[PDB]
Amino acid sequence: EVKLLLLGAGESGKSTIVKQMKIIHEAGYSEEECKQYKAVVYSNTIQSIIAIIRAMGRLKIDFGDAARADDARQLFVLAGAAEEGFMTAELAGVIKRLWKDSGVQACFNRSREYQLNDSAAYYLNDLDRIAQPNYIPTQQDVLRTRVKTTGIVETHFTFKDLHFKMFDVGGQRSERKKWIHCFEGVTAIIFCVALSDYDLVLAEDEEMNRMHESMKLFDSICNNKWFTDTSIILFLNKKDLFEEKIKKSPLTICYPEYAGSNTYEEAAAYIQCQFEDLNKRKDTKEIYTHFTCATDAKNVQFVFDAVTDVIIKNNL
Ligand SMILES: Nc1nc2c(ncn2[C@@H]2O[C@H](COP(=O)(O)OP(=O)(O)OP(O)(O)=S)[C@@H](O)[C@H]2O)c(=O)[nH]1
Ligand SMILES: [Mg+2]
Incomplete structure (x- = not known):
């Protein structure tokens, strides 16, 4: 012992x-245990993109493409779904376009100025995989989760x-x-x-x-x-x-x-x-x-x- x-x-x-x-x-x-972390993965992913978008306001960083302003609106309208363990194609696309914006990237690289999960890039780089229909967290996806x-x-x-x-x-x-x-x-x-x-x-x-x-x-x-x-x-x-x-x-x-x-x-x-x-x-x-x-x-x-x-x- x-x-x-x-x-x-x-x-x-x-x-x-x-x-x-x-x-x-x-x-x-197990698969049942992994599915339990699905909502944590989506929650961590949405929290991360929101945290960068929030910091852009504090730090006065504009989006690179102005069209992202509407994605950022749609982000908040659609984000509640993710908390429940769901991720539509519409929500994935919004997050993806946001994450690829040069202004969002500029703010990502300034993350020591605010509070941002260590696994933000890890999930955000893997959106196409985590957003797929019938997604089940891998071991690594579970390891990457953050819960206080x-x-x-x-x-x-x-x-x-x-x-x-x-x-x-x-x-x-x-x-x-x-x-x-x-x-x-x-x-x-x-x-x-x-x-x-x-x-x-x-x-x-x-x-x-x-x-x-x-x-x-x-x-x-x-x-x-x-x-x-x-x-x-x-x-x-x-x-x-x-x-x-x-x-x-x-x-x-x-x-x-x-x-x-x-x-x-x-x-x-x-x-x-x-x-x-x-x-x-x-x-x-x-x-x-x-x-x-x-x-x-x-x-x-x-x-x-x-x-x-x-x-x-x-x-x-
Ligand atoms: N890239 C990378 N990420 C790590 C490493 N260790 C932990 N993480 C990630 O860091 C985040 C925080 O890790 P976590 O295990 O929760 O810390 P903790 O000590 O338990 O935090 P606490 O507030 O409850 S006390 C998690 O998302 C986890 O995946 C590491 O060695 N490398
Ligand atoms: Mg702990």
Whole structure:
């Protein structure tokens, strides 16, 4: 029996790690389960396109083609259908034309100025597939969904002859108060950090850098004596998004003293060091750091294999 607690700021990837466990260890979302996420996929897709359209007003970005102004009207008239799990051909076309507009694209590429789901491009690039008649979410479509965690989610699986129980709580500021309900009997903490959050600010507070907030939480948890004998595992998550992001958005927005290059390896290492240096007892307490892409089953499989090895060797 092994108890794992997923901790981390909102949108760090915790509940996506929980889904991956189910996919790799259990054996995938059945068709009935996938159909359940259909409305979440459509909801996430419509919320994303609306969020970009909303930001265009704040940021005074015009559509590239004026004809999109009528698509944007039709978008709101037809959007309620999507919430119910339906997607007409008319609604797909509207969203597609919007998504292809150069003004909409200009605003998409300015998304750190507002709040936009990580999976916006992923669904929006796949409209023709997700809008098809009788669409059923794939495993990846399910992994990509975004729903806020309220409460405490418990999942169970078997791996390497061990019974895992995995606990997942919300990481938004409003849910932090509930972390303490999970602190008993923990074999290991998996602390998730969104690597690509370095240039973002909190949904709950525009003046707080997302990665700074993540550092404060890690500092708190990592140095809590209650957890002296709990294995502390750090997942530096969203490394795929990070990779892309680091090429065009300076790390100095987050860490003004960063002197390295705008490259994946140097910047990833630096973030790791910033987090591991919050450890106040480095000679007595080890952090196990892994760099992850939560949505990628092959990455999470091999990483969780290594994590389990460590838990197996250290607890017993
Ligand atoms: N591209 C990419 N997307 C990811 C990765 N990890 C998570 N995501 C996506 O990020 C979004 C947020 O992930 P999620 O699992 O909900 O975070 P969370 O920690 O559980 O968020 P919370 O508010 O309830 S506490 C989801 O849409 C998910 O698919 C990743 O490694 N790469
Ligand atoms: Mg969660």
